[PDB]
Write a protein that binds this ligand. Structure first.
Ligand SMILES: Cc1ncnc2c1c(I)cn2[C@@H]1O[C@H](COP(=O)(O)OP(=O)(O)OP(=O)(O)O)[C@@H](O)[C@@H]1F
Length: 1726
RNA sequence: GCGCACCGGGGA
RNA sequence: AACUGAAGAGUCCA
RNA sequence: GGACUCUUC
């Protein structure tokens, strides 16, 4: 309060323009100490400074002395004047924020001027009214951040002290326009000696003012020394000429010292393959191939799923006895033997329960009732009878005869004999296998079909719900050997008429032991598996064969591979079946590196360490088998005898390497992945030297000295002039090369076209709150005693690790491990001391006892484990919605949350703001072949780093060469790569190792401190560079948190190693780091270091550095040796397109070219950029962002996009799954995959849906598509094209009617007979009437009966839980997202929706669960199984079912059932009506060709297939600029048609236009129709299709499949809308031509301009708000009078649009009308 | 026969 | 009681 | 405008 008022008195005094007019108000604002008087003076001063630039904007002279109208006339009270000649310009200004109130004030001003217009214009001088109403207190007389600081204080005065008014509330409307970095002045600057030290480091020995001559003389003396010491052997070469003969020999011998055999032929290789593993033994072996039992079983599963849980031992056994009774009854009557496996039978919950023990258990149970008091034969029946009544109570249904429950004497003499089911937990030789292994051929699809059935049973094993497993199998040490299953779980599958059973014991998603079991032979095989990894092979037996056949067609023409095609096909199929049977991550990586191998092979130079990068650590036998198969395949295709068709073989092998995508992304183990990610984070820092363990918010002195020391060490890299020479592998940037890079940026040598940067504080993007909101994660700090917690507790962590070790001992070590030995005694002693829960070793155990006793005094496991954590997690939206509940502004921008919020920092240092330092946290990413460490900062960190990124993206977009935030630049890069490979020019396909882990914010700080952006004005330049220096130093001192699991695992490992409980004494660096700290007594919680920018955190910042540094490197090389380079970078990726002279030099003197490549390597490394070993130089192929470009062909990644669609996509309802697969397949077709393979993938998805027991309606997938259904259509077109094949006769009549209709609506003729007649009501009568009124034969009565079953008709499907128009809502949300209350409503809705969606079971297993439950909502508040609906349809008479070949179900429902009391007639929807609606909406979107006649192709040209005839194609379209209907059109139409609802819902949220339509909008026909329909009928939205259009991205399609596709064919206003308003407005009220008046008109662009070309093109666009003058346009403002531009009573210029028949309707529809008409006509002549 | 950071998972 | 920062595209929803 | 899914870095 009292301090804030003094602060703003100082701020206004210090910062304010020296204008005398404002001075009088400034001297009065500094003295009114009364808070009300201070507030009034402040508002007055803001109003004066707003009205003083508007007068300087519109040219009017300011009435400083409030000269009344009489005063100026002699020489009510205006705010301006320009009276000259007969032209008087009266200006008045105001500031209102409410768009409703704005109108009131504007009307008042109009009245105040119009009450004297007549009197003034009566005698001599004519009046020209002018208004400059503003919507906020912007006031650029004050500097930008002050307008926010002053506004906040001014508002707070009345909000806190003036409690005695809510009218001028623009004091809440935020008045800023910039990024928000400048708001750091609102905080106190406490930057002490440390900041000065860091900056002095950044500015020491670095001479950034070199001229181009000094730079070019210093850069050609690095080259002489480098070249001489490279020829002399003192510098290690890093690039090797490609041999193609010594490079294959290197892949063959890659694993020679791991024991792999020298070589093998196919016969031994196939023999090994068909026997390697239990699955692979089983896939190629020789398998050599109603009932009351199911009625009880299928009925008792429901009974326990609808009754009490925790079914006791007694209750489950009754179900076993009942199933046995049913089985005996079926045996006696029917004479059948199914449902058994030897002497075990399938009981209720998959349970493979055994007869002998089920009989034996019943012997004891009945014997109990002998002493418990009719007889045994009657007592057991009464047990079942009591259960039977209770089971039936929960309301049979399915048939279930009760007569099979008479007595139990049958059990007493029931004997079933057979084999026993077993699981072998230990490895068994391939001699116990009972089938002739290796018989099934590979040339067919028998093996891919057995994997499909077996994989499906591995996925189904995750659905079993865990229940009590009485009757254990084995005891002691036999439990992990051959186990005789007395009670397990089983899943039955059926292979070629043989009933196999997958037998397991553990229920869940974890890795288990499975055993395949047969009724004739007992166990078949056993294995260990993680079921979640086995989904892609399900129902894909035909996709995975067409994939291999497609790849083989590529190489079928190589005449010198003509005798080797059979082996190549065999080997490819072997590779595919191996990676599908054994989904290993170490095989994923091995298949992935093959793309780098082949990329090197086709290229010219490669890194010397390439083959150390390709090598992968293999473990199992199948991984070495996979390497053997890959070696054989490559050795076949890449022979030196084969020379022709190299492009096809590169394509082939690259797709073989992309087969790695058939293995799931998910982590095989989480803890290992997390430990490895942390090792990746920590190892580079330990190797550098800087790991500051456990930093604090108030950084100590030792930490600061360490950071300064290592910052100094970062910059001291040496190169090629030191005796040791350049030292790669060392992080750092030189000083010579830093002061050359900045010396030539500050010189206009890098970016020349001579350049003109512009200040990136002004041009930086402004980020709202919702830009940073999502459902992703964010760290939440934990506070105790009011201070953030940053340290794990050693006592609590030690106790927790001891408890975990005790648990693991109890499960595993207690029952094994030679219980009289050392380790048993040690871990027993360590386990007794844990209470509550259900040598140096002596000293350490003493300490451990003390610590655990201390903790158990303090507390017993859940609380401890939650008290060790130091962080929590939320979503971005939860944190933001909590944050916006603290701010006090209207607009929700980031600057309002960091600096002007309630919990915002107050002072700041160079280490961090008042509210702690920036803090991240670590997690891991699940990706294909590799570990990514992920940094999740808390909310404040995310906001501040977002400000940094906005700044550096603003810089990067001003310089040409970065493809990170520039799609035009990326397309130019693609075109340049294509042209380069076309001419056979060299092209270096670069890649950078350790982008994140090596570049640091200190490097960016040094570079920023030495760069000069605006060399015209230096003060603002240095000030902005200062703001960014501060923000980048906050990232120098960030604290990265060590995950909880990592420290917990490390402490368990520590305790084990301390007690001696470990085999070896090998320790990686990370374990040393953790153990050194655990010994002294401190837990490493957070880590600070000089390195590690963060993976993708400073992404735009590092992209900017990459851009400028690469530009310097290419410039240096061009200066050194001729030529040139064209580099496109994308922040860790680069493509360098060499010149033609460099390409020639490669052939002239290849030693010189290798010297130039080595010099490029050296210069890059001296600037902290380590080129990856996966970097090639070549003339054959290019590479940028996984997009390969060979010369005379296209490279489709067929296997990546086939494999994308086959995975367990996390989808929740059966229509979402179909839409997802449609999208993936659209992507595939766009990227080279043929279409006949896409149809197979769609059939695979439909089969997955059918397995789930879902009715397959015509609206799921179209599995008969062409090329044209993807290139030219969208999803709605594919739905049309499926319905047009189900009922092709009627759709012809519907399309004839639609062609006749759509043509009339667009013209605008038949609107009422469509709108409010026959798009509402009974659908069939509507369709008939529409056909009648257009003179088209109506659909026959039979055609109107076709229907489709809509199971979500009444309400969407109720999915199991694991745990106002739409047009107005659309525009409302779009306009309201930028307001605090609007953002809060959106955020709250998203939070609740996400909390609901997270509890829904997702995936194939969840889909089957959902569709097996009561998922169909009945008409009036009830739930029914899908089977209930299908049964009621089956009973009802007349409803037929029809199906096409694929399985698409369309019904036939007579048109009298809805009347005739049919409860299942409300689920059906007529199919022609839906066809009409789909066809109409997609004709609005795609075009009018959709309504033409489908004509099949009659090619008959007898051409060759040519499988690699790929052809780029573009979706042909007709409307590009004609139908660019935007949001403004819909807003204007909505206001015109529905005013009250518009002003109730859309007016408050509307700005940047402020309702300045002036009633000259075009009044679009066919848009008002759509708007009127969407307000009324909310079933179909036509307006969302008008604003939608098919993109013009290219599709790479086979040129043969393009010929077989069907053929169908039927058939600037943005600028002119601006010109339209000016020409018609001028007549009613002549207006002044200024920047604010012209831009005020709603229609306005954001030398064909003609009359206003000069001002709009540059003057308006640049930002100078000046009046348009006669000096331009070929100091007196030009008043726009009726029909021409006027200067002094004469039309010095004239403007006129092309008036039309409809344009004149607006002008004559405006309510002096004749006078306006008369003057209009005279102008039209000239 | 899984995981394969020595450490976990593999019958309530 | 675990999985980020961006880029492109598509689908759905109100 | 929000959500979701694929590919990329
Ligand atoms: C911020 C972020 N969040 C999640 N994912 C990210 C990133 C970033 I920046 C890159 N990626 C992805 O990581 C894969 C390549 O990883 P990459 O092949 O480079 O492994 P690597 O160990 O660094 O190999 P080199 O150092 O020898 O180049 C690839 O999907 C993509 F690049």
């Amino acid at each position: 309060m009292e301090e804030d008022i003094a602060y703003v008195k100082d701020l206004v005094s210090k910062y304010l323009v020296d204008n005398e007019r404002l001075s009088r108000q400034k001297l009065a604002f500094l003295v009114q100490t009364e808070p009300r008087m201070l507030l009034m003076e402040g508002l007055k001063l803001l109003s004066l400074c707003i009205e003083v630039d508007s007068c300087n904007a519109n040219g009017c002279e300011h009435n400083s002395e409030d000269k009344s109208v009489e005063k100026i006339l002699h020489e009510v009270v205006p705010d301006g004047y320009k009276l000259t000649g007969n032209v008087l310009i009266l200006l008045e200004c105001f500031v209102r924020s409410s768009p409703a109130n704005f109108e009131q004030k504007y009307i008042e001003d109009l009245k105040k001027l119009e009450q004297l217009r007549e009197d003034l214009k009566s005698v001599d001088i004519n009046l020209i009214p002018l208004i400059d109403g503003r919507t906020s207190f912007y006031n650029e007389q004050l500097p930008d951040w002050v307008n926010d600081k002053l506004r906040d204080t001014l508002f707070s005065l009345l909000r806190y002290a003036q409690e005695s008014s809510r009218l001028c509330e623009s004091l809440s409307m935020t008045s800023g326009r910039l990024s928000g970095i400048e708001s750091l002045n609102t905080l106190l600057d406490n930057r002490s000696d440390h900041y000065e030290e860091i900056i002095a480091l950044c500015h020491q020995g670095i001479n950034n003012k070199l001229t181009a001559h000094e730079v070019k003389l210093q850069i050609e003396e690095e080259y002489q020394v480098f070249r001489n010491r490279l020829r002399g052997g003192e510098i290690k070469c890093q690039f090797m000429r490609v041999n193609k003969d010594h490079l294959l020999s290197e892949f063959n011998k890659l694993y020679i010292d791991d024991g792999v055999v020298v070589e093998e032929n196919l016969e031994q290789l196939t023999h090994q393959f068909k026997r390697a593993s239990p699955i692979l033994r089983f896939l190629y072996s020789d398998i050599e191939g109603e009932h009351q039992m199911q009625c009880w079983r299928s009925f008792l599963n429901k009974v326990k799923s609808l009754r009490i849980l925790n079914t006791r031992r007694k209750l489950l056994l009754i179900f076993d006895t009942l199933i046995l009774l049913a089985s005996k009854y079926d045996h006696i009557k029917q004479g059948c033997l199914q449902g058994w496996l030897g002497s075990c039978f399938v009981s209720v919950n998959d349970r493979l329960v055994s007869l002998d023990s089920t009989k034996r258990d019943l012997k004891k149970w009945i014997e109990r009732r002998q002493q418990v008091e009719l007889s045994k034969n009657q007592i057991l029946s009464s047990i079942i009878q009591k259960t039977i009544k209770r089971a039936t109570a929960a309301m049979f249904g399915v048939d279930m005869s009760v007569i099979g429950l008479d007595c139990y004497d049958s059990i007493m003499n029931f004997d079933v004999t057979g084999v026993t089911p077993t699981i072998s937990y230990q490895k068994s030789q391939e001699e116990t296998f009972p089938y002739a292994m290796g018989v099934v051929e590979l040339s067919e699809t028998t093996d891919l079909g057995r994997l499909s059935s077996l994989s499906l049973a591995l996925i189904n094993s995750m659905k079993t719900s865990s229940t009590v497993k009485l009757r254990q199998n084995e005891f002691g040490a036999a439990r992990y050997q051959v186990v005789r299953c007395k009670e397990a779980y089983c899943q039955e599958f059926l292979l070629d008429g043989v009933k196999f059973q997958l037998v397991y014991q553990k229920t869940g998603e974890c890795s288990k032991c499975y055993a395949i079991n047969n009724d004739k032979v007992g166990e078949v095989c056993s294995f260990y598996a993680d079921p979640k990894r086995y989904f892609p092979a399900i129902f894909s037996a035909e996709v995975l064969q067409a994939t291999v056949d497609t790849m083989i067609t590529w190489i079928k023409d190589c005449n010198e591979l003509e005798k080797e095609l059979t082996h190549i096909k065999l080997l490819t199929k072997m590779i595919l079946v191996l990676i599908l049977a054994h989904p290993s991550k170490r095989s994923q990586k091995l298949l992935q590196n093959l793309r780098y191998f082949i990329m090197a092979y086709v290229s010219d130079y490669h890194h010397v360490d390439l083959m150390d990068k390709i090598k992968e650590k293999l473990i199992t036998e199948t991984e070495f088998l996979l390497y053997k198969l890959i070696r054989a395949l490559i050795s076949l295709i890449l022979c030196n005898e084969v020379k022709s068709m190299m492009t096809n073989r590169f394509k082939f092998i690259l797709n073989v390497s992309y087969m790695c995508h058939f293995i799931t992304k998910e982590t095989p183990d989480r803890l290992t992945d997390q430990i490895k990610c942390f090792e990746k984070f920590l190892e580079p820092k330990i190797e550098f030297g800087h790991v500051s363990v456990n930093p604090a918010d108030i950084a100590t002195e030792e930490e600061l000295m360490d950071m300064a020391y290592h910052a100094k060490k970062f910059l001291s890299k040496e190169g090629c002039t030191a005796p040791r020479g350049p030292e790669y592998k060392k992080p750092g940037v030189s000083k010579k090369f830093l002061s050359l890079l900045t010396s030539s940026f500050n010189n206009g040598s890098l970016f020349k076209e001579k350049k003109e940067l512009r200040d990136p504080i002004i041009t930086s993007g402004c980020a709202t709150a919702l830009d940073l909101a999502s459902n992703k994660s964010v760290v939440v700090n934990k506070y105790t005693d009011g201070s953030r917690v940053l340290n794990y507790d050693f006592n609590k962590l030690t106790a927790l690790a001891v408890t975990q070790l005790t648990e693991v001992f109890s499960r595993k070590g207690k029952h094994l491990l030679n219980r009289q030995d050392y380790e048993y005694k040690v871990q027993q002693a360590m386990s007794n001391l844990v209470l509550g829960s259900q040598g140096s070793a002596s000293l350490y155990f003493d300490q451990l006892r003390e610590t655990v006793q201390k903790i158990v005094d303090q507390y017993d496991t859940g609380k401890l484990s939650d008290d060790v954590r130091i962080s929590e997690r939320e979503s971005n939206s939860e944190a933001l919605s909590k944050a916006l509940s603290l701010t006090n502004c209207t607009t929700a921008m980031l600057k309002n949350l960091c600096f002007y919020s309630q919990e915002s920092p107050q002072s700041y240092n160079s280490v961090g703001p008042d509210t702690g330092r920036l803090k991240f946290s670590l997690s891991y990413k699940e990706q294909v072949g590799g570990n990514r460490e992920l940094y999740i900062g808390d909310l404040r960190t995310k906001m501040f780093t977002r400000l940094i990124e906005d700044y550096f993206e603003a810089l990067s977009l001003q310089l040409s060469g970065s493809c990170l935030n520039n799609e035009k630049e990326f397309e130019n890069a693609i075109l340049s790569m294509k042209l380069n490979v076309s001419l056979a020019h060299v092209s270096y396909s670069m890649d950078h190792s350790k982008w994140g882990p090596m570049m640091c914010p200190f490097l960016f700080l040094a570079v920023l401190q030495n760069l000069i952006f605006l060399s015209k004005d230096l003060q603002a330049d240095i000030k902005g560079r200062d703001y960014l220096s501060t923000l980048l130093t906050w990232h120098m001192h960030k604290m990265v948190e060590i995950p909880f699991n990592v420290v917990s695992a490390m402490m368990k490992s520590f305790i084990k190693a301390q007690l001696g409980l470990r085999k070896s004494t090998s320790q990686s660096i990370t374990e040393d780091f953790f153990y050194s700290n655990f010994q002294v007594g401190v837990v490493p919680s957070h880590v600070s270091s000089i390195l590690d920018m963060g993976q993708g955190i400073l992404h735009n910042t590092s992209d900017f550095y990459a851009l400028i540094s690469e530009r310097f490197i290419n410039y240096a090389i061009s200066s050194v040796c001729g030529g040139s380079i064209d580099a496109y970078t994308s922040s860790d990726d680069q493509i360098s397109l060499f010149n033609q002279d460099l390409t020639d030099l490669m052939q002239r003197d290849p030693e010189e070219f290798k010297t130039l490549l080595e010099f490029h390597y050296y210069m890059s490394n001296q600037l902290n950029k380590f080129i990856s070993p996966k970097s090639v130089v070549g003339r054959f192929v290019a590479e940028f962002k996984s997009r390969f470009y060979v010369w005379g062909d296209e490279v489709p990644l067929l296997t990546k996009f086939v494999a994308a669609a086959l995975h367990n996509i996390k989808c929740k309802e059966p229509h979402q799954l179909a839409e997802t697969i449609d999208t993936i397949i659209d992507q595939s077709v766009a990227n080279g995959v043929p279409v006949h393979l896409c149809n197979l993938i769609q059939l695979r998805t439909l089969s997955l849906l059918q397995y789930a027991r879902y009715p397959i309606d015509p609206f799921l997938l179209n599995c008969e598509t062409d090329v044209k259904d993807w290139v030219d259509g969208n999803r709605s077109y594919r739905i049309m094209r499926q319905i047009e094949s189900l009922i092709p006769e009627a759709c012809g009549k519907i399309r004839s009617m639609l062609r006749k209709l759509f043509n009339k609506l667009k013209t605008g003729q038949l609107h009422e007979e469509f709108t409010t007649n026959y798009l509402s009501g009974e659908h069939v009568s509507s369709l008939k009437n529409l056909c009648i009124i257009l003179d088209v034969d109506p659909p026959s009565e039979s055609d109107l009966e076709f229907s489709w079953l809509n199971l979500a008709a009444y309400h969407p499907l109720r999915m199991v839980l694991r745990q106002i128009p739409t047009i107005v809502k659309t525009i409302q949300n779009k306009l309201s997202s930028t307001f605090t209350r609007g953002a809060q409503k959106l955020l709250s809705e998203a939070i609740n929706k996400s909390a609901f969606q997270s509890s829904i079971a997702s995936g194939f297993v969840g889909l089957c669960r959902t569709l097996g439950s009561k998922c169909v909502r009945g008409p009036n508040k009830e739930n029914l199984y899908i089977k209930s609906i299908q049964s009621l349809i089956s009973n009802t008479q007349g409803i037929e079912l029809l199906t096409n070949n694929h399985g698409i179900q369309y019904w036939r429902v007579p048109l009298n059932l809805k009347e005739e009391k049919i409860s299942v007639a409300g689920y059906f929807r007529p199919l022609l009506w839906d066809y009409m609606c789909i066809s109409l909406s997609t004709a609005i979107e795609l075009g009018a060709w959709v309504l033409g006649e489908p004509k099949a192709a009659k090619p008959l040209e007898f051409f060759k297939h040519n499988p690699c005839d790929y052809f780029p194609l573009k979706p042909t379209a007709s409307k590009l600029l004609e139908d660019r209907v935007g949001v403004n059109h819909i807003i204007h139409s909505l206001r015109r048609l529905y005013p009250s609802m518009f002003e109730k819902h859309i007016l408050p949220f509307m700005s940047d236009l402020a309702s300045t339509k002036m009633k000259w909008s075009p009044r679009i026909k066919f848009l008002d129709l759509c708007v009127a329909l969407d307000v009324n009928c909310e079933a179909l939205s036509l307006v969302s299709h008008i604003v939608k259009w098919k993109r013009e991205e290219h599709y790479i399609v086979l040129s043969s499949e393009l010929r077989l596709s069907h053929s169908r064919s039927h058939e600037s206003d943005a600028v002119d809308n601006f010109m339209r308003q000016i020409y018609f407005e001028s007549y009613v009220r002549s207006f002044v031509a200024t920047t604010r008046t012209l831009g005020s008109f709603t229609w306005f662009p954001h030398q064909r301009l003609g009359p206003f070309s000069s001002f709009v093109e540059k003057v308006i666009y640049k930002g100078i708000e000046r009046p348009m003058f006669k000096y331009d346009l070929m100091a007196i403002p030009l008043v726009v009078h009726r029909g021409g531009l006027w200067e002094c009573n004469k039309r010095l210029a004239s403007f006129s649009p092309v008036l039309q028949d409809q344009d004149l309707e607006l002008f004559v529809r405006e309510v002096l009308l004749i006078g306006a008409l008369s003057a209009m006509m005279l102008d039209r002549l000239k």
